[PDB]
Amino acid sequence: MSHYKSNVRDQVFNLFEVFGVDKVLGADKFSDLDADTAREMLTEIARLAEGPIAESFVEGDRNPPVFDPETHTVTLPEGFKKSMRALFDGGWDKVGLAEHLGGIPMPRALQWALIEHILGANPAAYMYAMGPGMSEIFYNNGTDEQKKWATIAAERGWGATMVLTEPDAGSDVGAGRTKAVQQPDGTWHIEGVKRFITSADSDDLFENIMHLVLARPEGAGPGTKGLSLFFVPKFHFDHETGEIGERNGVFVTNVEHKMGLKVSATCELSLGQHGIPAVGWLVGEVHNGIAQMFDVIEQARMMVGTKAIATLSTGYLNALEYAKERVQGADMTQMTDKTAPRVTITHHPDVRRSLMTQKAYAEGLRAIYLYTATFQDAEVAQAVHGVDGDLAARVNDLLLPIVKGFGSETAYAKLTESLQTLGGSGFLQDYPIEQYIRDSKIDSLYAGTTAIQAQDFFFRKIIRDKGQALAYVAGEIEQFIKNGRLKTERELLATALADVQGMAASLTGYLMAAQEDAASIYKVGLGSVRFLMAVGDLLSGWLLARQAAVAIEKLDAGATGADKSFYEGKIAAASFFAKNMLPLLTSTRQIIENLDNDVMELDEAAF
Amino acid sequence: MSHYKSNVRDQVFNLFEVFGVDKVLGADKFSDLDADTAREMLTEIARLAEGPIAESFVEGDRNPPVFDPETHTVTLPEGFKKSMRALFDGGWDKVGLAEHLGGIPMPRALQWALIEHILGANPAAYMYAMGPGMSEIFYNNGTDEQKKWATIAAERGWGATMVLTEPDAGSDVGAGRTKAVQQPDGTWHIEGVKRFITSADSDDLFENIMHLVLARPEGAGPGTKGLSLFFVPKFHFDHETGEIGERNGVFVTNVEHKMGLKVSATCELSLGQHGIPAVGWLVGEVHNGIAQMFDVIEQARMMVGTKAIATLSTGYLNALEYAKERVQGADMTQMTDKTAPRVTITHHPDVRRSLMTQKAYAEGLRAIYLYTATFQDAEVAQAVHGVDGDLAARVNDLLLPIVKGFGSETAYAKLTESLQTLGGSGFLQDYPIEQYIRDSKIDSLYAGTTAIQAQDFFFRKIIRDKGQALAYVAGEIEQFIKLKTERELLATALADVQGMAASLTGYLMAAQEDAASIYKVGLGSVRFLMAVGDLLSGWLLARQAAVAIEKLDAGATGADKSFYEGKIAAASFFAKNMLPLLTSTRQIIENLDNDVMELDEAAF
Ligand SMILES: Cc1cc2nc3c(=O)[nH]c(=O)nc-3n(C[C@H](O)[C@H](O)[C@H](O)COP(=O)(O)OP(=O)(O)OC[C@H]3O[C@@H](n4cnc5c(N)ncnc54)[C@H](O)[C@@H]3O)c2cc1C
Ligand SMILES: Cc1cc2nc3c(=O)[nH]c(=O)nc-3n(C[C@H](O)[C@H](O)[C@H](O)COP(=O)(O)OP(=O)(O)OC[C@H]3O[C@@H](n4cnc5c(N)ncnc54)[C@H](O)[C@@H]3O)c2cc1C
């Protein structure tokens, strides 16, 4: 079914009219890619997403993969594999890949806009297709000889996995017990059982799979510092030609039954447990595991956040299309009259409230991840923001937990409004929104839970950063607030910005107080997620207000037709968000300012 | 054990230590039911729920019902039918049923506490068991001759359905096109196609099904007031002996594929479309359909709210059990130390925040539906609250959309915390939370959407009521206010809710001169309903904490003491972390404008 509804219009609005990413197209790194070609690419992949890729969305959930425990392999439904081949045949598993690996150079902001369509149409299909992007990470961290293997893996389209989690080491990656035994010739034998590994087998989609495995070398120290990263291929291969050889000793031994995202095989992975060594090669031939793996984690966190946002967007557009056609009830101005005309439900206030809530968050979230991506290239950050490379890296690092944590939590919550808009029909599998909800629930968990996002945000991206990136962003919001038709929105933003600054000061204060009373640190934990969500709301309202300022300029200049309607919606979204979402941060600030440890002192038996 | 984790302790605490429902036990209608027996009943049905009822919770979802087009019937999984037999064999489908239909007289507050356990363990099992209760409603509204059939239906345990919805008439009940044609012999032939009918077929669970069908007699008016209610049995039967006769012309034509609650067969139901007439009997031989039907609707709305609350409770207790045993991470006071000992995750602040949020809403919601139920018996309301019958009915009517709307929305939202507590494992079908979420999503839709609940609440239960029930409840909150910090926070919340009510009232009355003003009522209606729910939750938790303080001062020990300590902590947490948000919501409601209504549809 054609469940997927795309929004290239909003993407191009952000990329060119708001952020001006076209400034760098046709110049330096992107010398061979112009704005017209970028638009055509977005339109092409959106068309592919709405057609062949979206067409197996239902099939993958209703006819999910089947595991053969004796072969340690998974069979995927044929319709989904056809969608994968459509993706490969169009070169879309090589989006933004380095030119020397066969890719088309482009800014990250354009790359994630392209990927959004796959994540909206069939997110597991993009996940299976992340191999080449992970081969590039292996390339960047590898020896000269390992770079040769990475080039083969990328050219041949091998799949890949990130292998961290164990039954007793999920959020606490440093507790992992999977071990690496050094061999005389410099290779390693990996031994352990890992859990919840995405794409650990993928039927016959690929020639090979590159497992990137965190493991502790024998006798290494404890914690994350003692971990190393290893290249562990499913098949041994000829390192010069790429010709596939003997099966390596790394076998899927279970596939989980999940709430959603069912077509993505989520696997228990056994290394060196079946009498065959799991041979691994030390990435870069250095012991720097968690640093190397965080290149992979950051990409995964960006993908998950963008996935949540893509899913909410098509959720909203499905609900909108339904509301426009569903006739139910009289206009509320006519409710007493038992003979009044029945109207389409977009006429009802609560439906317009729901739809505008969906719209504002979906479009605010789209702006967030594209804004985040403009700091992922130094050249783009310099051209559009005027910030140097170091600050740009700090700002991207600050925004990733917002994209991931705030994005995942918001999308799942607002999809509830999408389903509600359909009434009783929303509970039916006939419509895609119940699957959107199930497929999206994992986004608050995979690649680090929301709580982990919030702790990374505060401790690493603000405190350890000495507030530099946060002060930059705050300065940009302040400058927008300074400098008629958006006065009330700017006043509401000024209050929200002050609220967030108050929150940051309070949590910082609790951290300082921990010098004297260690228990005071618990208050940082108690408030960390609410703080992360508040910054997300602040950024959403700010970027929506920036969009409204651009929309006002285009309307003043004489926009007509569909363009005019688009711009009018941007003004309404920014105003609605500022008046209905931002004021809550004031109460949240007061709640955070009054946190106490009563709930930490309570006996566990009292719960 | 099973997926289902019950909480009789909290139920008894509410029923006896907080509301004092035991005052009426052993007296008048409840002469034969004492406190000890009520508690034993709760314990016994909780065991039934945790045992045979919960046993098929997974099976019903993984092996869902099948529609057979060769016979126009639905087949149910054997394990679930075994659970249903355990329910009937125990005499539980006659809980709160009138004594003359074979029931055990009891306060409604006890009845719903008992039903909570079935709704938490396998809610579709209660829905299939709603037959006798709907037969009683037929009895009460029926003629003397019909009362005899209703007695047969109840005694034989026939299934029953509520038949309102059509493809173009869901929320708008009055737009239905199903028609009724009177026959020479005084019966009626019903013709129409109805949608989203729960329990429309039930395999071989019952010997008959009573369909209660809204239909428009030919020549009748256009609105809901033009509707009449008809008794339409699946099988004809002997009106004196109950012997089952020929098939009546009412057939299921499909079974919907749903996100959850899969073992409850939700079907399109066609009347008089398969070659033979769907014979119906005018209920009470009077044309008063929507009024008769809302007896059934009120019961359904109480059921849905209690279902949502029951599901959140077992979701919370599953998450708590998991958190107590899951070891992950060092204590936050030892973040820096990578050599530090690993702890169970109840040690982590965000987990305790999550668990206390689940606890406070689950227990606050249980208090709300039990509180609501104390107004559903005149003698209980008199005994425990000192309120006459008329005010009690108005207060119950005021609270029903909160139980349903606030309960359904809150339960689904907070189950998100329950699943989150499990980490990645929460996403697995190996644990029950993911099914709880899917089964719960329907609660905001079935028996009136949240928006319909909010409109009923404001327009019918407050405005048309001239604010009397609301004034009563506000007066009880103000009396408790007059636990110092909690009472101060409750005073702010009460004032916030009163400000909200005044603002929405202004928008409604201003619609006389400016029609579009009414839209601001719709814009704020749901947020107002949820705010009142938060206020009631905070107030009732504070009342529980006040009782808990008294019991602790009197020397409570051991598990009792732990329980009482938890109530104090939940009341304080709720007042400090949930109630203040109502202040921002009031100011938002006070500044509602119609920009979103004036926007071109094309701009969305
Ligand atoms: C599984 C299931 C079980 C059910 N069981 C029963 C049952 O046994 N019998 C039965 O008769 N019904 C049953 N229902 C139907 C249910 O009771 C509701 O009447 C119906 O589901 C809601 O109407 P709809 O589905 O057509 O949605 P719609 O009426 O089309 O509502 C669509 C959207 O519009 C909104 N909307 C509609 N009118 C207004 C308005 N005036 N103001 C504001 N917003 C408005 C709604 O809130 C919703 O967001 C069931 C539903 C399902 C899915
Ligand atoms: C479908 C799926 C796909 C996945 N894909 C991948 C993948 O490809 N590769 C991979 O390596 N991993 C993967 N994971 C694993 C995933 O990253 C972990 O499940 C997740 O990060 C948390 O680990 P856990 O499940 O053990 O939860 P736990 O770590 O046990 O967490 C349980 C709860 O405790 C909380 N908690 C734990 N520690 C703390 C703390 N210090 N402070 C506060 N709260 C805390 C959490 O927030 C959560 O609420 C996947 C998971 C799933 C379910």
GROMACS .gro file of C-alpha atoms in nm, chain A residues 185-385:
model
  201
  185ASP     CA    1   5.002  -1.324   1.389
  186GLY     CA    2   4.826  -1.012   1.523
  187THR     CA    3   4.465  -1.115   1.465
  188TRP     CA    4   4.223  -1.166   1.754
  189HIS     CA    5   3.969  -1.432   1.849
  190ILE     CA    6   3.650  -1.274   1.984
  191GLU     CA    7   3.450  -1.474   2.240
  192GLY     CA    8   3.112  -1.377   2.380
  193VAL     CA    9   2.739  -1.347   2.328
  194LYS     CA   10   2.585  -1.015   2.223
  195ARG     CA   11   2.217  -0.925   2.227
  196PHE     CA   12   1.975  -0.703   2.032
  197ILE     CA   13   2.208  -0.668   1.731
  198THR     CA   14   2.030  -0.507   1.435
  199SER     CA   15   2.084  -0.670   1.093
  200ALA     CA   16   2.322  -0.936   1.229
  201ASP     CA   17   2.187  -1.155   0.949
  202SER     CA   18   2.008  -1.025   0.640
  203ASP     CA   19   1.918  -1.327   0.426
  204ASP     CA   20   2.077  -1.296   0.078
  205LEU     CA   21   2.068  -0.916   0.056
  206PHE     CA   22   2.447  -0.891   0.071
  207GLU     CA   23   2.766  -1.077  -0.014
  208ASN     CA   24   2.905  -1.027   0.337
  209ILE     CA   25   2.846  -0.843   0.664
  210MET     CA   26   3.100  -0.633   0.854
  211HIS     CA   27   3.042  -0.668   1.228
  212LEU     CA   28   3.206  -0.386   1.426
  213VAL     CA   29   3.243  -0.546   1.768
  214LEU     CA   30   3.340  -0.392   2.100
  215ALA     CA   31   3.537  -0.640   2.311
  216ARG     CA   32   3.780  -0.633   2.601
  217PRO     CA   33   4.131  -0.762   2.524
  218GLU     CA   34   4.241  -1.024   2.775
  219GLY     CA   35   4.391  -0.854   3.079
  220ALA     CA   36   4.273  -0.507   2.979
  221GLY     CA   37   4.136  -0.272   3.241
  222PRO     CA   38   3.773  -0.225   3.339
  223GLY     CA   39   3.512   0.011   3.202
  224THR     CA   40   3.475   0.162   2.858
  225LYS     CA   41   3.842   0.265   2.858
  226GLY     CA   42   3.942  -0.102   2.846
  227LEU     CA   43   3.739  -0.180   2.534
  228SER     CA   44   3.866  -0.214   2.178
  229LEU     CA   45   3.687  -0.222   1.843
  230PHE     CA   46   3.726  -0.514   1.603
  231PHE     CA   47   3.644  -0.574   1.238
  232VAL     CA   48   3.470  -0.914   1.239
  233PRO     CA   49   3.338  -1.020   0.896
  234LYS     CA   50   3.066  -1.280   0.855
  235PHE     CA   51   3.279  -1.445   0.586
  236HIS     CA   52   3.654  -1.443   0.557
  237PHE     CA   53   3.749  -1.290   0.224
  238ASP     CA   54   4.044  -1.231  -0.005
  239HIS     CA   55   4.186  -0.902   0.120
  240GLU     CA   56   4.306  -0.806  -0.230
  241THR     CA   57   4.013  -0.909  -0.451
  242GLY     CA   58   3.718  -0.926  -0.211
  243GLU     CA   59   3.637  -1.284  -0.314
  244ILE     CA   60   3.432  -1.441  -0.036
  245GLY     CA   61   3.591  -1.731   0.149
  246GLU     CA   62   3.531  -1.943   0.458
  247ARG     CA   63   3.255  -1.866   0.707
  248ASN     CA   64   3.388  -1.681   1.011
  249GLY     CA   65   3.284  -1.795   1.357
  250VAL     CA   66   3.010  -1.540   1.427
  251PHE     CA   67   2.657  -1.679   1.427
  252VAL     CA   68   2.309  -1.548   1.501
  253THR     CA   69   2.152  -1.771   1.765
  254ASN     CA   70   1.819  -1.593   1.817
  255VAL     CA   71   1.590  -1.336   1.655
  256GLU     CA   72   1.362  -1.134   1.882
  257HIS     CA   73   0.984  -1.101   1.855
  258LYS     CA   74   0.926  -0.726   1.875
  259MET     CA   75   0.640  -0.481   1.915
  260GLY     CA   76   0.727  -0.328   1.580
  261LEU     CA   77   1.004  -0.273   1.329
  262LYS     CA   78   0.953  -0.645   1.279
  263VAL     CA   79   1.125  -0.674   0.940
  264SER     CA   80   1.454  -0.561   1.100
  265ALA     CA   81   1.613  -0.880   1.233
  266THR     CA   82   1.716  -0.803   1.593
  267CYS     CA   83   1.958  -1.076   1.687
  268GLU     CA   84   2.149  -1.251   1.958
  269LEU     CA   85   2.499  -1.287   1.812
  270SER     CA   86   2.738  -1.562   1.928
  271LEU     CA   87   3.111  -1.514   1.868
  272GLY     CA   88   3.342  -1.814   1.896
  273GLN     CA   89   3.081  -2.037   2.062
  274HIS     CA   90   3.039  -2.297   1.785
  275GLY     CA   91   3.390  -2.441   1.765
  276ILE     CA   92   3.494  -2.189   1.498
  277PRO     CA   93   3.705  -1.883   1.588
  278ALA     CA   94   3.546  -1.543   1.540
  279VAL     CA   95   3.852  -1.378   1.388
  280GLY     CA   96   3.867  -1.004   1.443
  281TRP     CA   97   4.108  -0.735   1.331
  282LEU     CA   98   4.184  -0.444   1.565
  283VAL     CA   99   4.041  -0.131   1.402
  284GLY     CA  100   4.328   0.104   1.322
  285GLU     CA  101   4.553  -0.148   1.500
  286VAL     CA  102   4.513   0.070   1.810
  287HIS     CA  103   4.323   0.015   2.140
  288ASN     CA  104   4.066   0.306   2.124
  289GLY     CA  105   3.734   0.115   2.121
  290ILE     CA  106   3.473   0.347   2.266
  291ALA     CA  107   3.617   0.650   2.085
  292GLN     CA  108   3.605   0.465   1.752
  293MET     CA  109   3.260   0.316   1.819
  294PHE     CA  110   3.114   0.658   1.899
  295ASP     CA  111   3.161   0.753   1.534
  296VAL     CA  112   2.911   0.472   1.474
  297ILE     CA  113   2.686   0.564   1.767
  298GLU     CA  114   2.659   0.928   1.660
  299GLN     CA  115   2.545   0.822   1.313
  300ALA     CA  116   2.296   0.578   1.467
  301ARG     CA  117   2.159   0.847   1.698
  302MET     CA  118   2.115   1.089   1.408
  303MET     CA  119   1.940   0.814   1.209
  304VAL     CA  120   1.705   0.720   1.494
  305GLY     CA  121   1.604   1.080   1.556
  306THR     CA  122   1.550   1.140   1.185
  307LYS     CA  123   1.351   0.815   1.169
  308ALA     CA  124   1.115   0.929   1.445
  309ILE     CA  125   1.068   1.263   1.269
  310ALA     CA  126   1.006   1.104   0.929
  311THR     CA  127   0.745   0.874   1.084
  312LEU     CA  128   0.557   1.154   1.260
  313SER     CA  129   0.550   1.355   0.936
  314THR     CA  130   0.384   1.080   0.733
  315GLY     CA  131   0.163   1.007   1.034
  316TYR     CA  132   0.047   1.369   1.031
  317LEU     CA  133  -0.009   1.380   0.655
  318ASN     CA  134  -0.216   1.060   0.668
  319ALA     CA  135  -0.430   1.205   0.947
  320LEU     CA  136  -0.469   1.533   0.757
  321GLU     CA  137  -0.576   1.356   0.438
  322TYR     CA  138  -0.829   1.156   0.641
  323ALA     CA  139  -0.967   1.458   0.826
  324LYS     CA  140  -1.023   1.647   0.500
  325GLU     CA  141  -1.249   1.369   0.370
  326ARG     CA  142  -1.425   1.240   0.683
  327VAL     CA  143  -1.774   1.388   0.724
  328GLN     CA  144  -1.896   1.371   1.084
  329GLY     CA  145  -2.099   1.609   1.297
  330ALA     CA  146  -2.228   1.961   1.247
  331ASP     CA  147  -2.023   2.276   1.280
  332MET     CA  148  -1.993   2.370   1.646
  333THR     CA  149  -2.167   2.701   1.575
  334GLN     CA  150  -2.468   2.483   1.480
  335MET     CA  151  -2.459   2.214   1.749
  336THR     CA  152  -2.805   2.290   1.891
  337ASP     CA  153  -2.963   2.249   1.545
  338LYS     CA  154  -3.046   1.879   1.493
  339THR     CA  155  -3.085   1.944   1.117
  340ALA     CA  156  -2.766   2.141   1.050
  341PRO     CA  157  -2.540   2.029   0.764
  342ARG     CA  158  -2.274   1.774   0.848
  343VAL     CA  159  -1.920   1.895   0.786
  344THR     CA  160  -1.577   1.750   0.724
  345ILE     CA  161  -1.403   1.707   1.058
  346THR     CA  162  -1.134   1.965   0.981
  347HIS     CA  163  -1.410   2.212   1.074
  348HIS     CA  164  -1.409   2.096   1.436
  349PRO     CA  165  -1.187   2.288   1.682
  350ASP     CA  166  -1.034   1.987   1.859
  351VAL     CA  167  -0.936   1.837   1.522
  352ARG     CA  168  -0.765   2.160   1.416
  353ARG     CA  169  -0.591   2.172   1.755
  354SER     CA  170  -0.473   1.813   1.706
  355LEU     CA  171  -0.366   1.871   1.344
  356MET     CA  172  -0.178   2.192   1.424
  357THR     CA  173  -0.009   2.016   1.717
  358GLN     CA  174   0.099   1.740   1.478
  359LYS     CA  175   0.204   1.991   1.213
  360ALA     CA  176   0.403   2.222   1.441
  361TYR     CA  177   0.601   1.940   1.602
  362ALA     CA  178   0.661   1.749   1.277
  363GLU     CA  179   0.784   2.063   1.100
  364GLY     CA  180   0.972   2.195   1.403
  365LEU     CA  181   1.145   1.859   1.434
  366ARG     CA  182   1.232   1.858   1.064
  367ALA     CA  183   1.392   2.199   1.112
  368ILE     CA  184   1.585   2.070   1.415
  369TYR     CA  185   1.752   1.778   1.238
  370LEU     CA  186   1.831   1.985   0.928
  371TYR     CA  187   1.966   2.266   1.148
  372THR     CA  188   2.175   2.005   1.330
  373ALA     CA  189   2.306   1.872   0.998
  374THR     CA  190   2.425   2.219   0.889
  375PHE     CA  191   2.692   2.192   1.163
  376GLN     CA  192   2.813   1.850   1.041
  377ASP     CA  193   3.014   2.003   0.755
  378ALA     CA  194   3.267   2.272   0.843
  379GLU     CA  195   3.212   2.436   0.503
  380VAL     CA  196   2.835   2.452   0.549
  381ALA     CA  197   2.859   2.576   0.909
  382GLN     CA  198   3.098   2.850   0.795
  383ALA     CA  199   2.889   2.948   0.492
  384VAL     CA  200   2.544   2.956   0.653
  385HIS     CA  201   2.625   3.033   1.018
   0.00000   0.00000   0.00000
